[PDB]
């Protein structure tokens, strides 16, 4: 053995004599063998202060000796062309490499090699990162990190080997990764770089499995660099199963006596081909049912029994309801700004109830789909001293929610659109949405300020207020010259009814300041309906209106896909009516209807049916304000026609404006010979419109199969009609019948749309084969993502 008296120290600098003592197991007065000393040495390393410790016997004393790790005084960079100094230094601190701490010398190469992977993630394999560690007079060190970032390496081929039923291209078609992306016919068609290939093989598996190739396998996926490490090859070798028809489903496992309800959940009409996604539904439908009856983590697995004789598959589905658990608490770590209710209210797993593997996860998708948090991570911890109690933790990192946004688009009906404004999604972490948006068309200057509560009611009923301003100029909207300087307020409840359905109901006020009204029969028929008798012969006039509305709305969306819908209908219906106490007295009803009906299994041949309906009228023998009129024509309605060109037209009076008639064309001006009334091809639209199109979506047949599905050709037959329902056909006997809708304006044509860098694109070329008297054509039209 050996007995200690004192404990002396050599090489203590930053570490106080106290800090050394508190880590040493062997104390003054103890009796110590050469084994306890190893465990004391062993412990002083475990503190992380020291580079090298040795504990020795000096007669009756125990002598501890240390060389402390050097202290970082500087961290400089020099090379970091793709990564900001502040972003790297923030990551170093994270990993315990911070100025004022010591240097883990055996980790220098670790630090080096630990940053390359960062550069390999983005695809800059040709990279580097050595470190210079400059010693400094008093056991300090300057850490310099010399970066030599490379050329980013691009993916020069994606090959498939073994594909016999489907051209290698058609398959690559549906991948996130591309071996070629176009420009100057540019298609916003993903990048040309490489990472996390896992998941693009999952889409390959599905594409085969979903077409009855049950025995389909991916043999090997090798990945190549070029020696220069600037090109990247990818090969997936596959084995195409023969096509197999489904026979039936044997269910076998810890069913929890629920075979009653599963024996028909695994009932499949015999003859239909194997379908890998209908399997994964079935499997989840079971996990949904076992979750329904308490079980937290129901496992299900399906190994198809293959029979090459008749070529069929008997699907063998193993079940295991497993255990049940109980959620003691649902905790939220991260919410340093957002309120606890703001995340908790987005939960689908109830606390003080039985754990759902789904409802915990569903709770997470519902949490990042808010966009309030950068990262959301779950964590189901079993509560200490309990078999079946758990705590579900959601770790959030909060995102900066406020953002300025600015966008310019270019259409025909619009011209140059300038969307712009500031938005705030999560006001002071309350869920409140405040935003000051404004848009500038050729005809409209609009700008609103919003405040919205997305949960007025705990069940997701939104109560938002809008406060808006709109200066509208009709002779820029290809309409009879008017000017409307409107502004008001609107409070609106939004009811979530159903996964697919929602309702809107609101009370609004509106100020309509009318001015610069060049006379016109239909416009004036409205004006002495309000008890206004202004002048038939000049442009100097005014009409102020103070209205209060009740607005309502229903929206039913079941489109298979947001972007290029292939299946199911959308329907919006937005109407309103004037609450007594208003200067006007009318109601308005507009209904839009789009339907997709695919004819081929691959869904490349969709049939689209669109229908837009409008109707309003006055209640107190008055008429509907002409600014509330319905129009038809342009891209958004009936193509081949000019914007708003469909419907009634102007029947003008003789007059003159303070224009000072120089050398421009005018309509029904005194200067050029004012008889009485002048018919025109100047559109006014009406109070009764009905358009309806039938568009046949097809493949795009001269573009590379690799990305052919990126652009959507279609052929359409468009028809429409507007009419004035209070048009005195009698009194104006000479003038055309604008109470008769019988005149249907039809047109046929071809459409393209894809995504350019300039934004989403949409081209239309239509010949209005059946147009009526004064309809301005416009055969080619387009938009570049007005937004």
């Amino acid at each position: 053995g050996f007995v200690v008296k004192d404990i002396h120290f050599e090489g203590l600098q930053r570490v106080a004599v106290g800090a050394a003592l508190l880590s040493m197991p062997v104390r003054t007065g103890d009796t110590v063998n050469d084994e306890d000393i190893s465990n004391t040495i062993r412990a002083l390393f475990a503190t992380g202060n020291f580079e090298d410790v040795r504990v020795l016997r000096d007669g009756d004393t125990l002598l501890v000796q240390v060389k402390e790790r050097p202290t970082i005084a500087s961290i400089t960079f020099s090379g970091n062309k793709s990564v900001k100094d502040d972003m790297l230094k923030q990551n170093l601190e994270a990993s315990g490499v911070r100025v004022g701490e010591s240097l883990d010398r055996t980790t220098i190469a670790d630090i080096e090699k630990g940053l390359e992977d960062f550069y390999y993630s983005v695809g800059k394999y040709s990279a580097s990162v050595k470190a210079v560690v400059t010693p400094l007079p008093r056991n300090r060190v300057d850490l310099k990190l010399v970066f030599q970032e490379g050329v980013s390496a691009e993916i020069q081929q994606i090959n498939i080997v073994g594909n016999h039923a489907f051209t290698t291209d058609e398959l690559i078609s549906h991948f996130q990764l591309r071996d070629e992306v176009p420009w100057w016919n540019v298609v916003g068609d993903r990048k040309y770089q490489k990472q996390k290939l896992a998941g693009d093989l999952e889409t390959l598996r599905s594409y085969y499995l979903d077409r009855g190739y049950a025995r389909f396998n991916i043999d090997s996926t090798q990945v190549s660099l070029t020696p220069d490490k600037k090109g990247i090859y990818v090969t997936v070798n596959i084995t195409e199963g023969d096509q197999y028809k489904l026979s039936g489903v044997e269910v076998s496992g810890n069913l929890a006596g629920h075979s009653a309800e599963i024996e028909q959940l695994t009932k499949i009409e015999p003859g239909e081909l194997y379908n890998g996604t209908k399997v994964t539904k079935m499997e989840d439908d079971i996990k949904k049912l076992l979750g329904r009856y308490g079980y937290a983590y129901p496992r299900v697995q399906s190994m198809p029994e293959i029979n090459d004789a008749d070529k069929t598959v008997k699907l063998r589905v193993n079940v295991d309801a497993g255990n049940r658990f109980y959620v003691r608490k649902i905790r939220f770590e991260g919410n340093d700004t957002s309120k606890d209710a703001v995340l908790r209210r987005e939960m689908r797993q109830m606390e003080g109830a039985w754990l759902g593997s789904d409802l915990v996860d569903q709770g997470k998708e519902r949490l990042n789909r808010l966009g309030f948090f950068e990262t959301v991570d779950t964590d189901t911890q079993r509560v200490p001293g309990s078999p079946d109690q758990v705590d579900v933790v959601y770790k959030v990192k909060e995102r900066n929610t406020g953002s300025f946004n600015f966008g310019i688009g270019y259409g025909t009906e619009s011209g140059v659109s300038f969307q712009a404004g500031v938005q705030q999604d999560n006001w002071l972490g309350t869920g409140y949405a405040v935003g000051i948006n404004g848009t500038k068309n050729d005809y409209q200057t609009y700008a609103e300020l919003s405040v919205t509560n997305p949960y007025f009611t705990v069940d997701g009923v939104s109560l938002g207020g809008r406060l808006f301003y709109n200066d509208f100029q009709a002779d820029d909207a290809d309409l009879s010259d008017y000017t409307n300087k409107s502004y008001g307020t609107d409070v609106t409840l939004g009811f979530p009814i159903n996964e697919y359905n929602s309702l809107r109901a609101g009370l609004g006020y509106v100020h309509n300041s009318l001015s610069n009204m060049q006379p016109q029969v239909a416009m004036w028929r409205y004006l002495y309906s309000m008890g206004e008798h202004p002048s038939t012969s000049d442009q100097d006039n005014s009409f102020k209106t103070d209205d209060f509305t009740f607005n309502y709305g229903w929206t039913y969306n079941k489109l298979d896909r947001g972007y290029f819908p292939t299946d199911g209908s959308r329907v919006n219906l937005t109407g309103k009516v004037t609450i007594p106490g208003s200067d006007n007295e009318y109601y308005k009803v507009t209904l839009d209807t789009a339907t997709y009906v695919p004819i081929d299994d691959d869904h490349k041949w969709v049939v689209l049916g669109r229908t837009r309906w409008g109707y309003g009228d006055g209640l107190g023998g008055k008429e509907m304000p002409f600014y509330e009129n319905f129009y038809a024509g342009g891209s958004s309605t009936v193509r081949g026609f000019q914007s708003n060109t469909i419907g009634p037209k102007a029947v003008y009076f003789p007059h003159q404006a303070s224009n000072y008639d120089p050398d421009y064309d005018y309509e029904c001006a005194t200067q050029d010979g004012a008889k009485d009334l002048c018919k025109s091809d100047d559109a006014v639209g009406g109070n009764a419109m009905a358009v309806a199109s039938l568009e046949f979506i097809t493949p795009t047949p001269f573009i590379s199969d690799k990305y052919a599905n990126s652009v959507r050709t279609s052929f359409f037959w468009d028809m429409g009609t507007v009419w004035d329902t209070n048009w005195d056909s009698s009194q104006y006997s000479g003038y055309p019948d604008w109470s008769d809708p019988s005149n249907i304006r039809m047109s046929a044509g071809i459409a393209l749309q894809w995504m350019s860098p300039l934004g989403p694109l949409v081209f239309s070329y239509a010949q209005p084969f059946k147009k009526y008297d004064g309809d301005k054509a416009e055969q080619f039209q387009f938009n570049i993502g007005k937004t």
């Binding site: 929610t401 310019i408 860098p757 934004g759 993502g785």
Partner: peptide
């Protein structure tokens, strides 16, 4: 993505 700029991560209040 579009012509213009969507400058996210700007302000809280």
């Amino acid at each position: 993505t579009r012509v213009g700029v969507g400058v996210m991560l700007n302000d809280l209040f």
